Amino acid sequence: QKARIKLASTNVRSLEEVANQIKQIAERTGVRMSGPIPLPTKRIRIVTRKSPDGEGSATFDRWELRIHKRLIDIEADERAMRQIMRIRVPEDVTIEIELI
Amino acid sequence: PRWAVNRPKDYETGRDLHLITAKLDMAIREDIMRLRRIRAYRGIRHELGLPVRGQRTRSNFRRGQTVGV
Amino acid sequence: AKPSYVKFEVPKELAEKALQAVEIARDTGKIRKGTNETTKAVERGQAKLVIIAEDVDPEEIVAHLPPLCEEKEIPYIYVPSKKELGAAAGIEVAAASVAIIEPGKARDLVEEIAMKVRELMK
């Protein structure tokens, strides 16, 4: 009777906007929602040699990509379920919903 | 145990044997001689006094005297 | 087949319905030349309009279609010349037998000339 929502994006602000929209949807209805839980960030780190050839001193680049995550639990209410089913997320945010 | 002797599965009789002192020495010499008779790669390496188990020889294994230019 | 093989005369109508009735059918049909290629076609009945020209010597690979004429329907006509036979249906070479299967809008004249040949000599 509860739904679990997982959010992930490479931009923090869009994630915050989507979470706030879900929070307000839950607020405008009588329904209990466990707050957005922040899960640990994913860091993808790649270290590469800079020069194309092998002459000279060795210097390195450290490229990094960060992926943020959030977790939200809400109880399945059809009046509130339709609203979150129709909210539109930006193209740089991934959302997945499941019933437990 | 059979896996503790120093010459298991003998080349001639096929048994598991342990050898000491002169018999051990002559058995090892016989093994090397067998390798040499059939002109195998390891036999040639034994004859020339060169490393047998695939080592590099450009840098190490140097035993001699410097040659001038 | 070959002019030195007296079968019958050279009717003008046979030539008219054998040569001038393929150009209107070449653009709406299929063409299969070659004596060896057509031999399997006639043997299995694949061919539909067999126009046998009298241009192939000797009587070695040509003495197979007349002996097979009584074995199947094989509606066949004769061609006087070969030089334009390939041009009429095919490519600019010398043709010996241009077999067309299921021509387009080439039924009345071909059927009439086939009946004429049936009543002429078989």
């Binding site: - | - | 031999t39 043997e43 299995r44 070695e60 690979i61 197979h64």
Partner: protein, 49 residues
């Protein structure tokens, strides 16, 4: 040049010395190996008499 012969053909009767592949229809012809039927395209180990 031209290779179409060895088939016993007379004035009105046509019969083929070389049979056709049982996997295929008539018209296809085997070789004259004599040991076995070459079959031209399929091959057969039959010890032709």
């Amino acid at each position: 040049g031209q290779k179409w012969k060895l088939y016993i053909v007379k004035d009105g009767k046509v019969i083929r010395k070389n049979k056709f592949c049982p996997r295929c229809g008539p018209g296809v012809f085997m070789a004259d190996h004599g040991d076995r039927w070459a079959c031209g395209r399929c091959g057969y180990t039959e010890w032709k008499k």
